[PDB]
Design a protein around this ligand. Structure first.
Ligand SMILES: O=c1ccn([C@@H]2O[C@H](COP(=O)(O)OP(=O)(O)O)[C@@H](O)[C@H]2O)c(=O)[nH]1
Ligand SMILES: O=c1ccn([C@@H]2O[C@H](COP(=O)(O)OP(=O)(O)O)[C@@H](O)[C@H]2O)c(=O)[nH]1
Ligand SMILES: CC(=O)N[C@@H]1[C@@H](O)[C@H](O)[C@@H](CO)O[C@H]1O
Ligand SMILES: [Mn+2]
Ligand SMILES: [Mn+2]
Ligand SMILES: [Mn+2]
Ligand SMILES: [Mn+2]
Lengths: 524, 517
């Protein structure tokens, strides 16, 4: 288009022949607006507001002041195809994303913008509907090209379609509800140019769901629930001294990624394994990629100078996925965890589903023909700062039983942090199973490695502090280091008392965790 | 203690002197009024129960083929029978305990837990005549009484028993029941082979007035009023051919449960969520468990060889709440269930309900769509596309809507009234059976006579809503007309404005958003 300049590097977007925008902008949201139910009608974010906000919405520059003091030679960088996959995404969010990309990315480095309709059922995105999307696209450069799936395949399914259709040496995947900051793609391209084996991910800022205000705020690990988790304080303390507070312009390696939003050399991406194409809908596809990448000769970095705003959803869901899809994706990811899969399996509930075993083994066959390294290696070199680097760091996993009263601890059915622990009759169920992390002395319910027992008799969010460090003595006591008192089950009440090996009420029996050397997947 | 067949636990309830510790009452009076006696007894004739023996033999209701089975008692897991009760009469409560001990081998019965849910009767009291507490001393040690300081409800009372149970398996029973031979043996074997199975005995009946033993429908669905309903005729026909006439000895799956008489592995039960302990007093806890059980990796089966007789009898806010909480497990279908029970707006404890929404997602429980397509695919509404119309049936010519006239119960006539946009003027359509029904009662069906009647899945209730807007009845090929504020059938003709109706389309959201408080 024409009108090129700073702020609209691809020209004035969204103008018809007449010269007036082809987007009917909405008036200010109502005064009599109920916010808690609007975040459901909008599918996670306030849509009355997004519809009233302009598609060419300026956004503050969130990169560090030192990041702006850089220079990139556009003529010497490879072009890249940005891929935006979307399903039933509202018009305002989807176009504001495309606008933000086209407005803030030089055309010299943007080969194309591929939009992937993953079987949307909205009338504006359907080819048997009002045709608002397709019609409006003619008002965008040819770079922007829409492609569809006749049926919803999921993130993995839709993302491969975009990458497979991409034409550039590099692709950059983005969400359909995003806004970028200046020079967001330039750092990624330069980094992948010098080593095609690097998968680089931008730092993700936020667009508030309710207010749409721009909110600011690199190393990311994982939880044994098979969820991404940001490096905590005690984990950043285990870092090498010179990497504990890296500079704002440095590329920092990350054990894991936050799911989507990354750039990668297309050829390499297909040679390090693309995406397990049996992963369904939403799920843990971000870890299988993270684990697989590192073990098979790749690098995962984050560029603090490449920042992108993202609408994290709140009090609502944008789409509906089946209940089994999440467990399947986790089971398949456990293939890359080797012996540690035994623990991951118990945290997610020792589940047994149809994880498509036939195709999962062919990935194991692929894994061995590629010579990919082990997860123990991964844990010892890529994520050595984790609380569980070896399965010896989980010495006890099982019921915490007091023989005197003949009972064991019980989460009372809610393993989520915040509620109180009670004494009940032992039935050997997951509700009465507890594991121990010796690196931080955390006593946690098996089904949630974020909940930690405290002297108060209740669970709370696990922090690697003196407020959660427990000691399991040789006598069998649960001693709390800070106060140096031991936990007693006297009268079916949880109390702290002077430690004393003669008090049978404070002697506990905790099963030892001596799992196998190799995890054998379940049956179907 | 004198043990043998018929009294597998020995002679129960005898004092040291050698005389029963229960004074039987004489035959009920001849000048007895049944309606007044069935009131003092609380549902069942208590004058008779008091005169009936606690060691009352009962006919074996099991199929003759069920008796040709063999169980090795030494290889079966012990089970804790839990009987919860509130203000249950002595005779009925004890005849049950006697029947259990009399018809259950001691090797497989770890204990029998009696749960007093805050009874206020003098015989059940720590400050009363102490009839129950004393008489229990004359029963084996297996029998253990425990109480709740205040009436907590079924959910509250049953959990107290399950938590107090010490056996790998528990069996929940009513306080007014009598068992058949080998009632517990089939259940234990089934749960031993797969701890994920929740097995239910088939329920026979004890008449309330005469106390006759009555023979007893193993497949159970549900209504959009959130009530269990036994598979109707047209529903059993949608079953696969190999399950339309199941054998008397085969275990048959049931989408839902009809009251809380079931056995389950204790560990499994607590991992499948157990019972929403925010459910209050009596209510629909049987469906919330059923939906949750199936979606979270469990099975609900019925054992036709395990039979139990049950004496069927003859606050209000708790019930609406329990239904709201159950709708959490229905996903988008809650929109339909919500309008059928009257768009209620109450304090459903929206806080603790979210902990279930997280609990459900942390467990990876499947969707209600899955449930309806795999567990209850024989239902009349498998998808919300099976309910295409929901709204007033309006005739623009006379400017009126249909009206249930304030009753909605089957049997009453439909009249024509002026549209006010209320629930009494709302009607939904089930396309699998062509039922025109009032929204507040999916058991009432429009008929050509101009009246509602019990919905039966027959050609006698199948309506067709044409593209022109007519209500055509398939059997007679006649259309409904509102000529003269009267409902009558006329030869169909799209040019007649009196037989053209406007019915709102039902295109609900993709996810149900609960109301506020
Ligand atoms: O079956 C699906 C599910 C999601 N998405 C899209 O994938 C992108 C990433 O998912 P999402 O943003 O919902 O994940 P989040 O980052 O919010 O956790 C979004 O544009 C979704 O609309 C898709 O195309 N198909
Ligand atoms: O607040 C209550 C109400 C009832 N029950 C007992 O729970 C059992 C099942 O209740 P209900 O009488 O409704 O059984 P149904 O008659 O529906 O089979 C009976 O033994 C009741 O006495 C109880 O423990 N607490
Ligand atoms: C910190 C991070 O990267 N992701 C968090 C995750 O750890 C946490 O369990 C979840 C629930 O609050 O929210 C998200
Ligand atoms: Mn997103
Ligand atoms: Mn943390
Ligand atoms: Mn009953
Ligand atoms: Mn019926």
């Amino acid at each position: 288009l024409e009108g090129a300049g700073p702020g609209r590097l691809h020209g004035r977007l969204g103008i018809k022949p007449d010269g007036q925008p082809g987007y009917t902008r909405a008036p200010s949201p109502p005064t009599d607006l109920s916010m808690p139910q609007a975040l459901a009608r909008g599918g996670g974010f306030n849509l009355y507001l997004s519809d009233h906000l302009e598609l060419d919405r300026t956004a503050p520059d969130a990169r560090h002041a030192s990041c702006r003091q850089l220079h990139y030679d556009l003529s010497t960088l490879p072009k890249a195809s940005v891929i935006i996959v979307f399903y039933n995404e509202p018009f305002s969010t989807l176009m504001r994303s495309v606008h933000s990309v086209l407005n803030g990315t030089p055309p010299q480095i943007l080969e194309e913008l591929i939009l992937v309709d993953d079987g949307s059922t909205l009338p504006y995105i359907r080819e048997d509907g009002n045709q608002q999307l397709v019609e409006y696209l003619k008002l965008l450069p040819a770079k922007v090209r829409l492609i569809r799936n006749e049926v919803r395949k999921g993130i993995v399914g839709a993302r491969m379609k975009g990458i497979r259709a991409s034409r550039a040496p590099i692709f950059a995947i983005l969400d359909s509800h995003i806004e970028v900051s200046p020079q967001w793609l330039e750092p990624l391209l330069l980094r992948i140019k010098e080593d095609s084996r690097r998968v680089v991910m931008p730092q993700i800022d936020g667009i508030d769901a309710e207010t749409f205000k721009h909110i600011a705020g690199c190393k990311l690990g994982f939880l044994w629930k098979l969820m991404e988790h940001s490096y905590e304080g005690h984990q950043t303390a285990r870092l090498p001294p010179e990497e504990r507070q890296p500079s704002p312009t440095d590329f920092q390696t990350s054990p894991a990624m936050a799911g989507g939003l990354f750039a990668a050399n297309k050829a390499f991406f297909f040679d390090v394994g693309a995406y397990d194409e049996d992963f369904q809908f939403w799920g843990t596809e971000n870890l299988e990629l993270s684990f697989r990448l590192w073990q098979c000769g790749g690098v995962l970095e984050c560029a603090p100078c490449s920042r992108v705003y993202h609408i994290f959803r709140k009090g609502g869901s944008g789409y509906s996925s089946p209940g089994d899809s999440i467990t399947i994706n986790k089971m398949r990811t456990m293939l890359w965890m080797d012996e540690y899969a035994d623990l991951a399996w118990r945290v997610i509930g020792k589940p047994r589903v149809n994880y498509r075993p036939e195709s999962l083994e062919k990935r194991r066959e692929w894994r061995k023909r590629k010579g990919c390294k082990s997860f123990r290696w991964f844990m010892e070199n890529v994520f050595p700062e984790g609380d569980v680097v070896t399965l010896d760091d989980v010495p006890y996993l099982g019921p915490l039983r007091n023989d005197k009263i003949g009972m064991c601890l019980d989460n009372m059915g809610w393993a989520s942090p915040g509620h109180a622990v009670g004494l009940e009759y032992c039935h050997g169920g997951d509700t009465q199973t507890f594991m121990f992390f010796r690196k931080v002395g955390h006593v946690m319910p098996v089904n949630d490695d974020e909940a930690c027992l405290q002297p108060s008799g209740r669970l709370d969010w696990c922090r690697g502090t003196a407020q959660f460090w427990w000691d399991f003595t040789s006598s069998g006591q649960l001693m709390f280091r800070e106060t140096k008192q031991c936990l007693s089950a006297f009268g079916r009440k949880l109390r702290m008392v002077e430690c004393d090996d003669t008090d049978p009420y404070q002697i506990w029996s905790w099963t030892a965790y001596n799992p196998p050397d190799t995890f054998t997947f379940p049956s179907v």
